[PDB]
Amino acid sequence: MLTLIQGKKIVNHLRSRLAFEYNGQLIKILSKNIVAVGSLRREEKMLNDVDLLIIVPEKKLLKHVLPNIRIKGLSFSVKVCGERKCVLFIEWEKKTYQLDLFTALAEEKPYAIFHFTGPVSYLIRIRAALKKKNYKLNQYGLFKNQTLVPLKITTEKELIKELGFTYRIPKKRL
């Protein structure tokens, strides 16, 4: 049970302590590919769990990075690991901290993290304003009507700005 402040420090250390195993060598993940989700992204007071979104560049790497991801400096434990989502408990500073790692393609990296935090009430309202124009968004990109229509989205803000929706601060996502 760590606070938003403690986890903020946590992500800082994690930012330089997360890498994948490809070709026998440890490939570190650029700090530019790290986004916060859930309450941690909504500057919430306390957070029960810390959901981190990893950006997988290559296609195969998506199912390569998650399964071959080692941690240096911190103690981790894998309990429920899959392909796109992995559950592992890591202990740091002689204490245990819950850390859930989930990967998303470069296309859903901005969209998924944004639609990660939500919550449901915030997500449902989001679609309402977009529905007026016939646009949808979620770990995949911007959809038109009911089919994935390719939209240009870079970084993260582009996903919302592109839809022409009123951009709101992460803390204002309720």
From Swiss-Prot:
Main localization of the protein described in the UniProt heading: virion
Domain of life: Viruses
Gene Ontology annotations of biological process type: double-strand break repair via nonhomologous end joining
UniProt cofactor note: In the presence of magnesium, pol X shows a strong preference for the ssDNA gaps having one and two nucleotides.
Swiss-Prot/TrEMBL keywords: Disulfide bond, DNA damage, DNA repair, DNA-binding, DNA-directed DNA polymerase, Magnesium, Metal-binding, Nucleotidyltransferase, Transferase, Virion
Gene Ontology MF terms: DNA binding; DNA-directed DNA polymerase activity; metal ion binding
Disulfide bonds listed in the record: C81-C86
Mutation effect (R125A): Loss of DNA binding affinity. Decreased dG:dGTP misincorporation
Database matches in PROSITE patterns: DNA_POLYMERASE_X (PS00522)
Region listing for Involved in ssDNA binding, in residue ranges: 42-51
Record site: Stabilizes dGTP in a syn conformation to overcome the Watson-Crick base pairing constraint: H115
Enzyme Commission number(s) from the entry: 2.7.7.7
Family: Belongs to the DNA polymerase type-X family.
Note: Consistent with its intracellular location, ASFV encodes its own replicative DNA polymerase and three base excision repair enzymes: a class II AP endonuclease, the repair polymerase Pol X, and an ATP-dependent DNA ligase.
Name of the featured protein: Repair DNA polymerase X
Phylogenetic classification of the source organism: Viruses, Varidnaviria, Bamfordvirae, Nucleocytoviricota, Pokkesviricetes
